[PDB]
């Protein structure tokens, strides 16, 4: 385990670019973290965006979030691939996010970000 609630990381899923995230406790298995079905270690995270989405993700696709200027890094890891404008204005508001984020401790982060979870009746 090397990260815990309340760090920032980025997360890169499925066609989704590198994207700024918070871990968090999943809300039904109350850990943010866990082995999977393969045997490999996942982090649960928060998406920072204007629409709250969470996901286990492979600990292999997350990165410690040090600022959003680390973007190119993560890419270096010439060819680039371009961005559809609805996703980079969702990730542009992320990484808004994420820089107020960056400026908080661990335990502020956690009271300002955590999300609300209700059960559909
Ligand atoms: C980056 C990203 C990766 C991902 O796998 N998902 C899924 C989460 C679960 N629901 C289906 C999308 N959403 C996002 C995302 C994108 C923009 N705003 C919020 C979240």
Aim: charged residues 30%; glycine residues 4%.
């Amino acid at each position: 385990v090397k990260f815990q609630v309340g760090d920032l990381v980025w997360s890169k899923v499925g066609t989704y670019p590198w994207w700024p995230c918070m871990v968090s406790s999943d809300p039904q298995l109350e850990v943010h973290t866990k082995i999977n079905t393969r045997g490999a270690r996942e982090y649960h995270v928060q998406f920072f965006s204007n629409q709250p989405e969470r996901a286990w993700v492979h600990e292999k696709r997350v990165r410690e979030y040090k600022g959003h200027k680390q973007y190119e890094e993560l890419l270096a890891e010439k060819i680039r691939k371009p961005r559809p404008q609805r996703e980079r204005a969702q990730w542009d508001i992320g990484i808004a996010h994420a820089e107020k984020a960056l400026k908080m401790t661990r335990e502020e982060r956690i009271e300002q970000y955590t999300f609300i979870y209700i059960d559909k009746q």
